Amino acid sequence: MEIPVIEPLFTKVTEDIPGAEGPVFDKNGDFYIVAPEVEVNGKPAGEILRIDLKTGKKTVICKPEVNGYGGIPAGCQCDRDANQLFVADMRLGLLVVQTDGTFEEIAKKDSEGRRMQGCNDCAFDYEGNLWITAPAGEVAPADYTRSMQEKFGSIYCFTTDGQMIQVDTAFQFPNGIAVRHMNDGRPYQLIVAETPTKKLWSYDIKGPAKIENKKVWGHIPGTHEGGADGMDFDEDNNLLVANWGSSHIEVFGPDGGQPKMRIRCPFEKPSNLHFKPQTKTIFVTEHENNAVWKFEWQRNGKKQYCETLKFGIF
Numbered sequence: 001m002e003i004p005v006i007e008p009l010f011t012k013v014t015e016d017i018p019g020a021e022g023p024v025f026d027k028n029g030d031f032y033i034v035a036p037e038v039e040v041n042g043k044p045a046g047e048i049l050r051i052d053l054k055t056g057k058k059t060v061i062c063k064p065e066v067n068g069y070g071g072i073p074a075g076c077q078c079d080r081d082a083n084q085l086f087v088a089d090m091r092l093g094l095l096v097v098q099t100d101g102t103f104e105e106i107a108k109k110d111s112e113g114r115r116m117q118g119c120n121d122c123a124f125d126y127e128g129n130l131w132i133t134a135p136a137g138e139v140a141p142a143d144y145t146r147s148m149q150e151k152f153g154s155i156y157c158f159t160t161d162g163q164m165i166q167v168d169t170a171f172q173f174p175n176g177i178a179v180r181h182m183n184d185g186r187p188y189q190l191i192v193a194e195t196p197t198k199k200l201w202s203y204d205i206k207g208p209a210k211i212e213n214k215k216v217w218g219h220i221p222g223t224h225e226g227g228a229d230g231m232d233f234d235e236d237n238n239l240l241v242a243n244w245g246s247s248h249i250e251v252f253g254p255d256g257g258q259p260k261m262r263i264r265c266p267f268e269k270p271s272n273l274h275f276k277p278q279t280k281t282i283f284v285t286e287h288e289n290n291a292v293w294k295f296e297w298q299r300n301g302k303k304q305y306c307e308t309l310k311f312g313i314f
């Protein structure tokens with residue numbers, strides 16, 4: 001159109017990853033994907049994989065389980081001060097995963113003593129606070145439920161001082177999440193996808209675990225089943241959003257509203273995305289083929305927290 005559509009070349013990266021999700025680079029430039037929807041005997045047995053970008057070969061580094069309850073690991077962020085992954089898990093809540101495949105479960109309960117909810121995606125701000133979507137109901141051992149039909153999905157902030165703070169509730173499947181920063185580095189806006197309602201929500205970030213000014217920020221095209229899944233900013237603060245079921249990734253300008261551009265994908269179900277540091281390359285997971293691809297965007301990605309320096313000067 002208007003809405004203008006681009007059709008970049010998609011190159012295959014790897015295949016056969018059930019529910020392929022949470023693409024992420026670590027501080028060494030290794031690449032990881034999660035496979036939330038792997039099952040064994042009809043029960044969750046989701047996986048965290050390292051992908052060799054040269055070969056497409058997959059290695060399962062972690063198949064998390066707590067007390068026999070398998071995980072549904074669905075979204076990732078790399079830490080800054082240690083080379084470890086924070087992983088949102090729909091059964092287990094928030095995990096911290098090492099490169100050696102060992103892991104720890106961070107919260108059974110929130111800061112107010114409520115049972116933790118299962119999580120789907122997360123985003124670090126540059127202050128090191130981790131903003132997390134929680135579209136599942138209570139974590140294992142509670143029977144699994146998810147908010148695709150009913151409004152019981154929540155949002156958390158896991159803070160630098162170790163608090164797991166519930167910051168909003170009553171979403172119908174909160175999904176992707178991203179933080180906008182001022183040019184100086186200050187976090188100031190949180191964006192949250194609400195998948196089936198075809199909305200992106202915004203908040204003003206007033207401080208760690210302090211959000212206000214909830215607003216319907218963006219509108220996701222289409223009336224397909226699905227909607228916005230994963231998201232990330234480019235270096236100009238355009239927000240790229242996988243629109244699962246639509247065959248497109250939407251591109252929002254800084255001010256939201258309607259997409260300014262769409263990216264046609266050669267598949268119906270883009271799920272999540274991530275830039276390779278220092279490049280224009282976006283890795284995309286998708287659920288039509290349960291596979292991972294890459295394509296070239298117009299500019300580099302916005303730096304993730306793990307690309308910033310604790311002891312930087314400028």
Ligand SMILES: [Ca+2]
Nearest residue numbers: 120121175229
């Ligand atoms: Ca997701």
Ligand SMILES: [Ca+2]
Nearest residue numbers: 231232273274
């Ligand atoms: Ca991402």
